[PDB]
Design a protein around this ligand. Structure first.
Ligand SMILES: Nc1ncnc2c1ncn2[C@@H]1O[C@H](COP(=O)(O)OP(=O)(O)O)[C@@H](O)[C@H]1O
Ligand SMILES: [Cl-]
Length: 179
């Protein structure tokens, strides 16, 4: 089972923290969006367009369940995986690290806001706020550790997670005595 499953909004650091945490632990890194494309030979966009969001979520859930069973390192989850009740069920018992971010920081870290085509319509920042409103309660539900990334740099985020993921060695005493 994974040492940590990372969840959070776009820009929260799933890729950056995934890589740095996996490096610090000396473990493998799997990202579920990448794994979907690798397992299907279809792009994420193509699956959504052709099959619809529900079938995307079906394929995603199967990939997530496989990774939770088979992967021993760091796993990062696609943003929408937690919308599936079956993914939330599958996660229970795992170490699930929710990388928290504000809307303004998430917008900044994903390339900034956009032009607002109509005064009466949304911009990117508003769409992001909506995503946050729908997703954040689900990440809070599934989490076993929550880490604020707004004012911690990646190294500080990784140190914070590491400090809460420690594994005592049952062979510690014998290693001092000999090994
Ligand atoms: N804790 C952090 N502090 C500052 N910048 C960060 C932090 N985490 C990620 N970033 C930056 O934000 C951007 C998006 O990070 P990324 O890891 O791609 O997010 P995600 O995979 O969750 O969308 C990258 O430019 C990355 O360097
Ligand atoms: Cl800290």
């Amino acid at each position: 089972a994974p040492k940590a499953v990372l969840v959070g909004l776009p820009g929260s650091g799933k890729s950056t923290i995934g890589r740095r945490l996996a490096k610090a632990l000396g473990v493998g890194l799997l990202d579920t969006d990448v794994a979907i494309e690798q397992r299907t030979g279809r792009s994420i966009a193509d699956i959504f367009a052709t099959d619809g969001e529900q079938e995307f979520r079906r394929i995603e859930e199967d990939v997530v369940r496989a990774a939770l069973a088979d992967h021993d390192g760091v796993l990062s989850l696609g943003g929408g995986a937690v919308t599936s009740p079956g993914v939330r069920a599958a996660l229970a018992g795992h170490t699930v690290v929710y990388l928290e971010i504000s809307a303004a920081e998430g917008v900044r870290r994903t390339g900034g806001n956009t032009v607002r085509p109509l005064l009466a319509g949304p911009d990117r920042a508003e769409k992001y706020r909506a995503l946050m409103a729908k997703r954040a309660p689900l990440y809070r539900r599934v989490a076993t550790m929550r880490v604020d990334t707004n004012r911690r740099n990646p190294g500080a985020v990784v140190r914070h997670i590491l400090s809460r993921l420690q594994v005592p060695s049952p062979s510690e005493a014998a290693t001092l005595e000999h090994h």
